[PDB]
Design a protein around this ligand. Structure first.
Ligand SMILES: Cc1ccccc1NC(=O)c1ccc(C)c(C(N)=O)c1
Ligand SMILES: [Zn+2]
Length: 139
């Protein structure tokens, strides 16, 4: 689990979105595993606006943060999960690292702010859904 709170927006993994997220929907993209809902309370997280390929992510299955090198956002084939088929996921970044299903939502940060959230795993790789291209999140 996990979310990003910026301005009057909440960014979550689309497969973990709640009824309240869907009832206050702003934007969702099934190919990216992202959903953004509106909030009444103001958030104060900052989204990174950069091309960093190094950062640190939170791994809830180890109660630890890990420094990683990750690939630029791209269209990657990902295997089937418990309730969803195998497909190409877009705007995905991969790194060598540990990730279990419940780790989804853990934030990847660089010196400029939030880069993305854990979205995929398997074969000793962790994949993060990028949010740096969503410039509207800060306006
Ligand atoms: C994070 C992880 C680690 C190890 C093994 C599997 C996972 N993946 C998931 O739990 C997961 C579940 C549901 C969906 C829709 C997606 C996705 N991004 O398409 C990923
Ligand atoms: Zn950066």
């Amino acid at each position: 689990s996990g979310a990003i709170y910026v301005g009057n927006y909440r960014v979550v993994n689309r497969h973990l979105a709640t009824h309240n997220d869907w009832a206050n929907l702003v934007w969702e993209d099934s190919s990216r595993d992202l959903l953004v809902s509106s909030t009444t309370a103001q958030g104060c997280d900052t989204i990174a606006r950069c091309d960093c390929q190094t950062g640190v992510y939170y791994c809830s299955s180890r109660r630890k943060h890990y420094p990683v090198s990750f690939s630029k956002p791209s269209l990657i084939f990902v295997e089937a999960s418990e309730y969803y088929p195998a497909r190409y996921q877009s705007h995905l970044m991969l790194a060598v690292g540990h990730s279990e299903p419940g780790d989804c939502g853990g934030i990847l940060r660089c010196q400029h702010g939030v880069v993305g959230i854990v979205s995929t795993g398997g074969n000793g790789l962790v994949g993060f859904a990028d949010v740096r291209d969503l410039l509207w999140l800060d306006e």
